[PDB]
Amino acid sequence: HQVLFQGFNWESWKQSGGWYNMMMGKVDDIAAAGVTHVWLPPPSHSVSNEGYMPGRLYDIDASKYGNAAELKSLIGALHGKGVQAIADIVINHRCADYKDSRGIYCIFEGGTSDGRLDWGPHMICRDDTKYSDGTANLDTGADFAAAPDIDHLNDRVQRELKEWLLWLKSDLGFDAWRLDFARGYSPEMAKVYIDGTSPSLAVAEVWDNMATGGDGKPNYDQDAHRQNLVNWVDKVGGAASAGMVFDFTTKGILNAAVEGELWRLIDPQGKAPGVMGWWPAKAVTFVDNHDTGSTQAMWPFPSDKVMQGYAYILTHPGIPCIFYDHFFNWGFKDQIAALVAIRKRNGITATSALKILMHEGDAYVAEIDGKVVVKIGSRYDVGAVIPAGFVTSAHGNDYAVWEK
Ligand SMILES: [Ca+2]
Ligand SMILES: [Ca+2]
Ligand SMILES: [Ca+2]
């Protein structure tokens, strides 16, 4: 059994009294709902309030989310209920605390009194010319415009970032990683960090744009999009590796499919159309995160159909990730916990078998491990496609589940 939970949103840093302190009062409900791992935000000093422009990686006390004591108390509470803590690891780029003789912020500070992570411009990808000194290797992935991109081919960078990651485990208690902006460096570089730190899992945010047609909707065929994700997993080490990816292919398809286009939820081979259909053991599915939803709203799930997204991901193969706001703020707590209970009760896991029974515009119905059937869509009647022996279980707005 494995169910992830994103334990923050884009406004969390503002929480009066501290976000981790507030989360202490949320631990029992998260664990009782069947969550096994909670993804926490970047914990270090950051030039931006939300944590995504880290500077002094060891300076946990500088975070807006709370200090190291408050973070360790929350991780200890999660562990007390048997739930793991996943740290948001932001290493594609990094802000430097000091200026060099050129007046450029390219002399870094790790946050410890010794030289750990106190890099210079030789550690900045040479092609990030706003900051580099032209001497490093070219970036192994995309650039993040607002800050120096780090040259992961540099041996000192690799060694000192692995030391820092191991310290997040040994000192703070983190168990696993979520790799931010993983399209910023190659999967071969991600492999150095994952293999060198043995996290229980490392879920990477590899977010490529989805191919769209002239009407603005994603294409029915997203094979190229999921092919890039499975190739990333192969390059990080495949089944041997602790690495896995967020299923952005399923997110993009599901965003469109629930708008009366549920025929999008099966490919021409009879499989789920996202990474779920090709390598479910490596696909972390989700309805929204702090970038797609929350107050950034870059690619929000249709608001009136969010429970159909959960009926889908919580009953299907792949590893589902529940978003904080949906569980605590939108009123879906009981419904989401009920769906996870159905998943756990029936022994459904990332590699459960999926048999799709109907895939029409207003009705998608699927059977998982021969034990659970789920329907989403506005169609009133799908009775004839429910196999014998199934009894109604949980239901809500445009979704229903049956158990056998
Ligand atoms: Ca230092
Ligand atoms: Ca950059
Ligand atoms: Ca980069």
Convert 50-80 into a string of H (helix), E (strand) and C (coil). Answer: CCCCECCCCCHHHCCCCCHHHHHHHHHHHHH
Ligand nearest to the CA of 58: 1
Task: Give CA–CA dist 392/239, Å, rounded.
Answer: 36
Task: Give CA–CA dist 324/378, Å, rounded.
Answer: 26
Task: Give CA–CA dist 134/244, Å, rounded.
Answer: 33
CA dihedral angle for residue 343, residue 349, residue 352, residue 356, rounded to 10 degrees: 50
- On whether 215 is known to bind a ligand per the annotation, the reply is no
- On whether 38 is known to bind a ligand per the annotation, the reply is no
> Checking DSSP bridges between strand 319-323 and strand 399-403, what pairing results, if any?
unpaired
Residue carrying the six token digits 């096994």: 36
Task: Give CA–CA dist 225/246, Å, rounded.
Answer: 12
Helix (H) or strand (E) segment spanning residue 35: none
Ligand 2 center to residue 53 CA distance, Å? 11
Ligand 1 center to residue 9 CA distance, Å? 31
The sign of the CA dihedral 268, 269, 270, 274 is: negative
- On whether 316 is known to bind a ligand per the annotation, the reply is no
Experimental technique used to determine this entry: X-ray
Q: Cβ–Cβ contacts within 10 Å for residue 44, how many?
A: 26
- On whether 278 is known to bind a ligand per the annotation, the reply is yes
In this structure, what DSSP letter does residue 364 have?
Answer: E
Task: Give CA–CA dist 205/98, Å, rounded.
Answer: 29
354-373 burial, b at 16+ Cβ within 10 Å, e below that, comes to bebbbbbebbbbbbbbebbb
- Under DSSP, is residue 395 helix (H, G, I), strand (E, B) or coil? strand
CA contacts within 13 A on the Cβ side of 97? 14
Q: Are 9 and 39 in contact (CB under 8 A)?
A: no
> Which of 70, 151, 175, 180 is an active site residue?
180
Q: How many angstroms separate the first and last alpha carbons of the chain? A: 19
Angle at CA of residue 368, ends 366 and 373, nearest 5°: 50
203, two tokens: 């879920």
Task: Give CA–CA dist 56/52, Å, rounded.
Answer: 12
Catalytic residue list contains 180: yes
To one decimal, the resolution in angstroms is 1.5
The residues that bridge with 284 in the sheet, in sequence order, are 246, 319
Task: Give CA–CA dist 122/151, Å, rounded.
Answer: 8
Task: Give CA–CA dist 175/139, Å, rounded.
Answer: 28
Task: Give CA–CA dist 119/106, Å, rounded.
Answer: 8
25, two tokens: 């009062």
Q: What are phi and psi of 399, to 5 degrees?
A: -150, 150
Q: For residue 235, give the amino acid letter.
A: K
Q: Are 211 and 249 in contact (CB under 8 A)?
A: no
Query: How far are the Cα atoms of 272, 296, 322 from residue 44, in angstroms, in the given order?
Result: 38, 21, 24
Ligand 2 center to residue 92 CA distance, Å? 9
Ligand nearest to the CA of 190: 3
Ligand 1 center to residue 154 CA distance, Å? 18
Q: For residue 227, give the amino acid letter.
A: Q
Task: Give CA–CA dist 41/172, Å, rounded.
Answer: 13
Q: What are phi and psi of 347, to 5 degrees?
A: 65, 30
Q: Cβ–Cβ contacts within 10 Å for residue 217, how many?
A: 16
- Nearest to 3, CA basis, from 285, 334, 241: 285
CA dihedral angle for residue 182, residue 78, residue 295, residue 225, rounded to 10 degrees: 30
Ligand 1 center to residue 357 CA distance, Å? 59
Task: Give CA–CA dist 267/78, Å, rounded.
Answer: 39
Q: Are 178 and 87 in contact (CB under 8 A)?
A: yes
> Which of 59, 151, 205, 325 is an active site residue?
205
Domains along the chain with CATH numbers: 2-347 (3.20.20.80), 348-404 (2.60.40.1180)
Counts for the chain of helices (H) and strands (E), in that order: 10, 15
Task: Give CA–CA dist 285/170, Å, rounded.
Answer: 29
Ligand nearest to the CA of 150: 3
Task: Give CA–CA dist 3/359, Å, rounded.
Answer: 26
The sign of the CA dihedral 256, 259, 261, 264 is: positive
- On whether 246 is known to bind a ligand per the annotation, the reply is no
Q: Are 87 and 43 in contact (CB under 8 A)?
A: yes
- On whether 109 is known to bind a ligand per the annotation, the reply is yes
158-197 burial, b at 16+ Cβ within 10 Å, e below that, comes to bebbbebbebbbeebbbbbbbbbbbbbbbbebbbbbbbeb
Q: For residue 248, give the amino acid letter.
A: F
Q: Are 317 and 279 in contact (CB under 8 A)?
A: no
CA contacts within 13 A on the Cβ side of 1? 16
Catalytic residue list contains 70: no
Q: Are 132 and 142 in contact (CB under 8 A)?
A: no
- Nearest to 137, CA basis, from 147, 123, 120: 123
Q: Are 273 and 318 in contact (CB under 8 A)?
A: no
Ligand 1 center to residue 56 CA distance, Å? 9
Residue carrying the six token digits 């290797």: 137
